[PDB]
Structure 1
Amino acid sequence: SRRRVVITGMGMLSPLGLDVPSSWEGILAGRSGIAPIEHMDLSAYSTRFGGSVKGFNVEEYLSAKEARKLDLFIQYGLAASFQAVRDSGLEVTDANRERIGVSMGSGIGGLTNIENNCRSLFEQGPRRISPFFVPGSIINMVSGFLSIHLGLQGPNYALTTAQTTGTHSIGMAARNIAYGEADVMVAGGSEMAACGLGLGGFGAARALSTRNDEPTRASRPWDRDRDGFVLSDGSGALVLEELEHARARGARIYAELVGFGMSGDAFHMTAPPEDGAGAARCMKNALRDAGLDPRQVDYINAHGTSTPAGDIAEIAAVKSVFGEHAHALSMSSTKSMTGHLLGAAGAVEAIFSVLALRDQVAPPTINLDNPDEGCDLDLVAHEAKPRKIDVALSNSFGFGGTNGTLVFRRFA
C-alpha cells in the first residue's frame, strides 16, 4: 500500500552554477547563463550560443583517469548525483544498499563521444575507435557508474523521453519507493548535446533561437518575438526517500513529492497540439494522483521552451486545467535564464520547484517584454515574486508527444 516520498538531498550543474545554491542565487537575481559557445568553431552554424556549464572541475568528484573515459553527460550526472547524496547525509551500508537505487536519464546521451569516435572511424578506420566508446557514451551509465562508486544495489535503470526525461525519471523513481521496491532513489537527468550533431541537428529542424547577436535575450518564453529554444547543458539529481525512513534517521526534508502524471499527445513527432490537450490530461493525472483541488496549486514551473507553438499550448493547457484559478497561481519558465537542458530540464526544474517551496518565491520569466496573444497569466515577468506557495508543479513536454508532471508541496 502506497508510501509517502520526500526530497532529502539535491545536486546540480547548470549554465548558472556548479551546485544548487549558486544556480538558485542566479534564478532569483534573474541572471542569464546563455553566452556564445567557445569549446568549438560554430561560424558554419545558424546558432552559435548556448547554456554552457562554466568551469566544471570533474577532479572534485573523480580521478582524471576515470573522467577521460566518460562523456561530459555522464560526468555531469555523477557530479549532481554525488552532490545530492552528500546533501542528503545518507550513509550506504550492507543494511540499506539493496534498498537504494538510481534512475538518471538523458535525451541524447554521449553525442560528443559518438561524434569524435565517428570522426576517428571515417578519417582513420575502425581500429581508432576507443575501447571505452560504448560504456563511456550510453545513457544508462550515469546509473551504473553511480551504483559502482556508492554500492547502490537497488533498482538501476534509465529513461530517455527526450525533453521529458528529467520529470519521468524523478516520477518513476518515486513510484519505486511508494510501492515498496526501494526506500531511496537517486533520480534526475543530465545532458551535453553542445556538439556539431546537436547544434547542427536542431539547426536542420529550424528548432533553435538564431538570436546570435543578443544570446542572453534569445530564450524569451511567451514573448511575441521568441524564435525557438536555447540549447543548454547540465545535470539535476534528487534523493527521494520514503518518509518514515527519512524521519527514522533525522533527515532534513525539503518537501514532499505528492503526485506524478504522464500522457501522450498522440498528435505530432515534434509539434505540441495548439490546445495543450495532452499536457492538460497529464496535469490532471498528476493532481488526481496527489488528491488535490487544482485551486491548491500556487506555482507552476512551466516547460516554457521559448517556441511559438510550445509556449501557447502550455497557456491553453493551464487555463483548461485550472479554469479561473489559472489567473491566481504564478507560472514561470526558468529556461528564460538556464535555457533548455533537454533531458536534464525536468531535473533542474524539479529542484527550482522544491526551492520555490522552501523560500516561498516564484522565480522570474526574464525577457518577457511583450507577452503574446493570449499569454495573460501571472508569468512572473522580469523579477522574482515573493508569495505563498504550498503546492508547486513542474511540467515537461518532449518529442513523441510525451508529457510528464510532478507535484511537490510543503512538508510539516
Structure 2
Amino acid sequence: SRRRVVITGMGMLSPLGLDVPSSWEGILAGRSGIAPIEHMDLSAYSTRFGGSVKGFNVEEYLSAKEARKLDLFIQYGLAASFQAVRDSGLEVTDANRERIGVSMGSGIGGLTNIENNCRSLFEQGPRRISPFFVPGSIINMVSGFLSIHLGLQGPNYALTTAATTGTHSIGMAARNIAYGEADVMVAGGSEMAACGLGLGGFGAARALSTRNDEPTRASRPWDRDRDGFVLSDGSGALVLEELEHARARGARIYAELVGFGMSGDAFHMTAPPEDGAGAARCMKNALRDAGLDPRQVDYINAHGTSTPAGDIAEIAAVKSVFGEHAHALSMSSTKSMTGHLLGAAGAVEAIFSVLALRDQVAPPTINLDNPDEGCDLDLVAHEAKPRKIDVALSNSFGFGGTNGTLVFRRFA
C-alpha cells in the first residue's frame, strides 16, 4: 500500500448485458439474467438453466481465424479486457509498455474445449486433437493473448482460486502497482463452465439450485427456500492505475482501490465454518490494509451465492466484524440477478461495487422473499436503494476455504 491505486476503465460480459452500462442498468432494475439453457440439450440434467451471455459476437474483438483457436472463456476475458482498456483511454507506447501488465484469471478454464477434444480423442484417436488445444485452453492465455494483442510487457500472470479468482486477480494486480512493479494492470476474470462436465460436475456435487420451473427465482441469497447456486458465464476486467499516473494523463477516475485482504478457512473443501470465522478474518484484513475502521463501511457486495451454509456464514461474519454498525451498512448479493460467474464473479462484483460508489445506490438482493433465521440486516431486498456510499467492500469465498475481500472508496 505504498503508491495509491485507482480504477480508470471497466469492461464486462454478463448474463445482463454485453457491456458495463447494459449490465448495470439490469442490476439497478432488479432484472434477472437467468434462463433455460439453449446451447445444449439438458434432459439427463437436474439443472437445466443458468446465466448465459446472450448475443456475444467475438468478431467485434477478434478475427474469426483467431477466435476459432480460443476457448469461449478466453474470448470472454479478452472482450472484457478490450472494453476496459478502451474505457480507460490509455495509449500504449514504447515509453510505457514495460509498465503495463495483465492478471486475468479463471476458475475452471477451458472445459468446453477440453470436452470437445476429449470427444475427438475417444472417437477417432489423438491425431484428431487440435494443435491449438493447449494454447487455446490454458488459463493464462487471456493474459498472454491480451499482452500480445496490445503489446503489454509488464507483469503477466493468472490466478485460479475458484469463486475468489477475480477478487485475488484484482487485489494482486493492485499490489504490483502499489509496490512499483507496474503503473497499470488489466485485472479480473472470465468463466464459461456451462458444458456437460460443468453442469454435470456441479450437479453431481448437489451444488446447484434445481428450480427448473422458475429459473429467475432460483438464485435467492439469504432466503429460507434457497437450494444452491446458479451457474453463470461471463467476464469482468478493470484497468488499475497508479494515481499520479492517472492524474498526469487526465484520466477519468471511478474510485480508489484502498484495501485487499485474504484468509483461508482451513475448515472443509466446500462448506464454510458456520460462524464464518475465515470470512471475518478476511474482511478485517482488508479493512486494516485500507486503514479503515469497520464503522466506515457503507455497502458490502456479498459473496451471497444462494447456498444453505454459505449465506448464513457470511451474515455471521458481517455481524462479528461490524458489531452494531452491521445494522447501518447495506449488504446485497447481485448474484440474485446474475447467478454465480465463478472465476469472473469477483471481477463483475468489483465493477458493481465501483458503480455503487459512482451512482450512490445499493443494488438489490432480488428474490429475498422470506429471510432466513438471523438474516435481519439491511440486505436491500427486492429494490435498489439510493443512499450515501463512501466505502464499498466486495467479498469472495471459494472452494477450499480461500477468501478474498476488496475495499473501494470514493476518490479525493
1:39-93: CA deviation from partner (whole Å, max 9, x where unpaired): 0000100000000000000010000110000000000000000000000000000
Give the C-alpha shift of residue 293 in structure 1: 1.2
The Cα shift of 1:345 comes to 0.2
TM-score normalised over the length of structure 1: 1.00
SS at match of 2:104: strand
| In 1, Cα distance between equivalents of 2:309 and 2:120 | 39
Q: Deviations over 1:341-389 (max 9, x none)?
A: 0000000000000000000000000000000010000000000000000
Alpha-carbon separation, structure 2, partners of 1:236 and 1:307: 23
- Any idea what the Cα deviations from partners look like across 1:117-157, whole Å, max 9, x if unmatched? 00100111111100000000000000000000000000000
Q: State the Cα deviation string for residues 211-232 of structure 1 (Å, max 9, x = none).
A: 0110000000000000000000
Q: Which residue of 2 aligns with 1:12?
A: 12
CA distance in 2, matches of 1:110, 1:273: 31
Q: Output the CA distance in 1 between the equivalents of 2:189 and 2:220.
A: 24
Q: CA separation in 2, counterparts of 1:276 and 1:347?
A: 22
**Secondary structure class of the residue paired with 1:133:** coil
Q: Once the two structures are superposed, what CA deviation does each residue of 1:25-52 show, in whole Å capped at 9, x if it has no partner?
A: 0000000000000100001000000000
Which blocks of at least 5 consecutive residues in structure 1 are unaligned? none
CA distance in 2, matches of 1:300, 1:3: 25
**Distance across 1 between alignment mates of 2:161 and 2:131:** 28
Q: CA deviation at 1:340?
A: 0.1
TM-superposition CA deviations, 1:219-264 (whole Å, max 9, x none): 0000000000000000000000000000000000000000000000
Corresponding position of 1:212: 212
Q: Deviations over 1:372-410 (max 9, x none)?
A: 010000000000000000000000000110000000000
Give a deviation string over 1:322-347, Cα, whole Å, max 9, x none: 00100000000000000000000000
Q: Distance in 1 between matches of 2:280 and 2:341?
A: 23
Q: Distance in 1 between matches of 2:285 and 2:118?
A: 43
CA RMSD of aligned residues (A): 0.5
CA distance in 2, matches of 1:256, 1:90: 18
Q: Specify the alignment match of 2:242 in structure 1.
A: 242
TM-superposition CA deviations, 1:12-36 (whole Å, max 9, x none): 0000000000000000000000000
Distance across 1 between alignment mates of 2:296 and 2:83: 31
Instruction: Give the distance between the partners of 1:192 and 1:293, measured in 2 at CA.
Output: 37
- CA deviation vs aligned residue, 1:158-210 (integer Å, no higher than 9, x gap): 00000000000000000000000000000000000000000000010000000
Counterpart secondary structure, 1:138: coil
Tell me the secondary structure at the aligned position of residue 181 of structure 2.
coil
Task: Report the CA distance between 1:279 and its aligned residue.
Answer: 0.3
Equivalent residue, structure 1, for 2:195: 195
Q: Report the equivalent of 1:42.
A: 42
Structure 1 SS opposite 2:287: helix
CA separation in 2, counterparts of 1:325 and 1:141?
43
Aligned residues: 412
1: CA distance between counterparts of 2:217 and 2:250? 44
Alignment of 1:266 onto 2:266: yes
Q: Distance in 1 between matches of 2:113 and 2:170?
A: 26
For residue 76 of structure 1, give the secondary structure of its aligned residue in structure 2.
helix
In structure 2, how many angstroms separate the alpha carbons of the residues matched to 1:317 and 1:293? 16
* Aligned-partner Cα distance in 1 for 2:403–2:39: 33
Counterpart of 1:314? 314
Q: Distance in 2 between matches of 1:214 and 1:153?
A: 47
Q: CA–CA distance in 1 between the matches of 2:26 and 2:7? A: 22
* Cα shift readout 1:265-294 (whole Å, capped 9, x = no counterpart): 000011011000000000000000000011
The separation in 2 between residues aligned to 1:272 and 1:18, in whole angstroms, is 33
For residues 96 and 43 of structure 1, what CA distance do their matches in structure 2 show?
53
Equivalents in 1 of 2:282, 2:236: separation in Å?
22
C-alpha separation in 1, matches of 2:399 and 2:34: 23
Partner Cα separation in structure 1 for residue 147 and residue 212 of structure 2: 41
Separation (CA, whole Å) in 2 of partners of 1:127 and 1:36: 36
Matched with 1:90 is 90
Q: 1:400 and 1:194 mapped to 2: Cα distance?
A: 21
Name the counterpart of 1:291.
291
Distance 1:225 1:400 in 2: 25
Query: C-alpha separation between the residues in 1 aligned to 2:181 and 2:8?
Result: 18
> C-alpha distance in 1, partners of 2:38/2:64?
22
| 1:136 aligned counterpart, secondary structure | coil
Q: Residue 135 of structure 2 aligns to a residue in which SS?
A: helix
Gaps of 5+ in 2: none
SS of equivalent to 1:137: coil
